[PDB]
Structure 1
Amino acid sequence: STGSATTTPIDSLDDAYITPVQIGTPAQTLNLDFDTGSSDLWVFSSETTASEVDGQTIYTPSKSTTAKLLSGATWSISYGDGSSSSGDVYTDTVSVGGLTVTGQAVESAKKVSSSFTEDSTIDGLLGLAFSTLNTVSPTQQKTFFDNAKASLDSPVFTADLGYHAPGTYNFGFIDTTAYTGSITYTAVSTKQGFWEWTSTGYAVGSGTFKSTSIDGIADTGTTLLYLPATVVSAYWAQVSGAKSSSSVGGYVFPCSATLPSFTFGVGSARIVIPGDYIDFGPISTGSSSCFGGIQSSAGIGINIFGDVALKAAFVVFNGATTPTLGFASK
């Protein structure tokens, strides 16, 4: 089997991407944030505290003839950005782009933090990191990909995120028309439950490539690119007037600037992030100070290849017995 679904930016900055997901019988379609940095599939639901729902589409398990309470199971998750959610668990039929999993754990939110409430466009998350991170207790549950894997033509999914435009998540096959040149594959460590890999270095604009190992995670659920302070300082030093602002919470730059590109290494290959991808617009409406899309990972504890990086590539998440990651230009 295979699946193929379009993923769409939630706003004009590509702050996140939503992908339609069919849950239950008859189908209830929710727009979920596919997140390769976590491993819970959770949804706004009929059980979500009413004051914490503001425009989201909810899953109502009582209206699904295939929903079954997973007795005794609860979940609770906290994300790197400080947001959180928790609730109980149903199993139900879940389909993504024509690919169907029966008996998928659908984690029903009883509580969500304010950032989720305030984002009416995201109806929940669909985790695509390794199932070892799944938060369901007392019986850990498998991700959608884990459950689908054996049925897939090939045990892979791919992320093809658009810049200010829709893109695609494919399951079970590699679309050879979706990228240019060849795919370069690189080793993955699953020791932290992430799609963790080591970049071979970077360049700023037309500058020379610096060979240096940068360990980080491929995370579709993080907006920006978070890298060591040395790397990030080198990038923003090439933008006149750029500075790190503690009050804003990162590097800002004059909105009048032309940003340089940023290149990262995948083995001997090179992925180029155009400068425009690194512009996240005025810090507040009407401001001439703009927020940077490359930020320091210092104090996160891990480097994160988020959407800013991933949307510059066609990315293969290879879930073979020994997982690997592939990157191609496009």
Structure 2
Amino acid sequence: STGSATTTPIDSLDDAYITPVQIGTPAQTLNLDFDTGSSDLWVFSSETTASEVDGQTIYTPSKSTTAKLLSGATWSISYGDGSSSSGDVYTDTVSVGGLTVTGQAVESAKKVSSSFTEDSTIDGLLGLAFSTLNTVSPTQQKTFFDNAKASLDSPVFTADLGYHAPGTYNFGFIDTTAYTGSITYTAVSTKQGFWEWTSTGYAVGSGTFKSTSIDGIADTGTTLLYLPATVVSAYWAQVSGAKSSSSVGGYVFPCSATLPSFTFGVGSARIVIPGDYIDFGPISTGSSSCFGGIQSSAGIGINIFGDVALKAAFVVFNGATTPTLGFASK
């Protein structure tokens, strides 16, 4: 089997991407944030504290003839940006782009933190990291990909995120028309439960390539590119007027600037992030100070190849016995 679904930016800045997901019988379609940095599939639901729902589409398991309460199971998660959610668990039928999993754990939110409530466009998350990170207790549950894997034509999924445009998540096949040149594959460590890999270095604009190992995670659920302070300083030094602002919470730059590109290494190959991808607009409405898309990972504890990086590439998440990551230009 295979599946193919379109993923769409939630706003004009590409702050996140939503992908429609069918849950239950008859289908209830929810728009979920596919997140290769976590491993829970959770949804706004009929059980969510009413004051914490503001415009989201909810899953109502009592209206699904295939929903079954997973007795005794609870879940609770906290994300790197400080947001959180928790609740109980159903199993139900879940389909993505024509690909169907029966008995998928659907984690029903009783509580969500304010940032989720305030984002009316995201109805929940669909985790695509390794199932070892799944928070369901006392019996850990598998991700959608993990459940689908054995049935897929090939045990892979691909992320093809658009810049200010729709893109595609495919399951079970590699669309050879969706990228240019060849796919370069690179080793993955699953030791922390993430799609963790080591970039071979970077360049700023038309500058020379610096060969240096950068360990980080491929994370579709993080907006920006978070890299070591040395790398990030080298980038923003090429933008007149750019500075790190403690009060804003990162590097800002004059909105009148032209940003240089940023290149990262995948083995001997190179992925180029155009300067425009690194512009996240005014820090506040009407400001001429703009927020940067490359930020320091210092104090995160891990480097994160988030959407800013990933949307510059066609990315293969290879879930073979020994997982690997593939990157192609497009």
TM-score, normalised relative to structure 2: 1.00
Q: How far, CA to CA, are the matches of 2:97 and 2:284 in structure 1?
A: 37
Matches of 2:323 and 2:17, distance apart in 1? 24
Q: Secondary structure at the match of 1:232?
A: helix
Partner of 1:36: 36
How far has the Cα of 1:125 moved from its partner? Answer: 0.0
Q: Distance in 2 between matches of 1:116 and 1:145?
A: 24
Aligned to 1:277, the other structure's residue is in SS state: helix
Counterpart Cα distance in 1 of 2:320 and 2:138: 27
Rounded Cα–Cα distance in structure 1 between residues aligned with 2:197 and 2:71: 37
Residue 182 of structure 1 deviates from its aligned partner by: 0.1
CA distance in 2 between partners of 1:178 and 1:242 (Å):
35
Cα drift, residue 40 of structure 1: 0.0
Secondary structure, counterpart of 2:295 in structure 1: strand
1:12 paired residue number: 12
Q: Deviations over 1:171-225 (max 9, x none)?
A: 0000000000000000000000000000000000000000000000000000000
4+ residue segments displaced more than 6 Å: none
Measure how far apart 1:101 and its partner are: 0.1
Offset of 1:262 from its aligned partner? 0.0
Q: What is the distance in 1 between the residues matched to 2:87 and 2:245?
A: 37
Q: Deviations over 1:35-79 (max 9, x none)?
A: 000000000000000000000000000000000000000000000
1:27 CA displacement: 0.0
Secondary structure in 2 aligned to 1:129?
Answer: coil
SS of the equivalent of 2:149 reads helix
Q: Can you list the C-alpha shifts for 1:15-37, whole angstroms capped at 9, x where unaligned?
A: 00000000000000000000000
Alignment partners' CA distance in 2, 1:26 and 1:198: 44
SS in 2 for 1:233: helix
The one-character-per-residue Cα deviations of 1:232-277 (angstroms, maximum 9, x if unpaired) are 0000000000000000000000000000000000000000000000
Tell me, in whole angstroms, the C-alpha distance in 1 between the residues paired with 2:248 and 2:7.
Answer: 30
Question: How far off is 1:147 after superposition?
Answer: 0.0
Alpha-carbon deviations, 1:269-303, whole Å to 9, x = none? 00000000000000000000000000000000000
Superposed displacement of residue 323, structure 1: 0.0
Looking at structure 2, the residues matched to 248 and 108 of structure 1 have their Cα atoms a distance apart, in angstroms, of 34
Aligned residue in 2 for 1:55: 55
The corresponding residue for 1:79 is 79
Alpha-carbon separation, structure 1, partners of 2:323 and 2:70: 30
2:178 is matched with which residue?
Answer: 178
CA distance in 1 between partners of 2:46 and 2:92 (Å): 15
Residues in 1 aligned to 2:186 and 2:147: alpha-carbon distance in whole angstroms: 24
Structure 2: distance between partners of 1:115 and 1:174: 34
2:160 matched to 1:187? Answer: no
CA distance in 2, matches of 1:267, 1:24: 42
Tell me how far apart the structure 2 counterparts of residues 291 and 243 of structure 1 sit (CA, whole Å): 10
Match of 2:125 in 1: 125
Distance 1:299 1:115 in 2: 21
| Residues 68-95 of structure 1 deviation map (CA, whole Å, 9 limit, x = unaligned) | 0000000000000000000000000000
Once the 2 structures are TM-superposed, how far is the Cα of residue 121 of structure 1 from its aligned partner? 0.1
State the partner residue of 2:281.
281
Instruction: Indicate the SS of the match to 1:42.
Output: strand
Say yes or no: does 1:298 pair with 2:292. Answer: no
| Cα distance in structure 2, aligned partners of 1:181 and 1:169 | 20
Please give the root-mean-square deviation of Cα atoms over the aligned residues, in Å.
0.1
Partner of 2:39, secondary structure, is coil
CA distance in 2 between counterparts of 1:251 and 1:63 reads 47
Determine the structure 2 residue equivalent to 1:164: 164
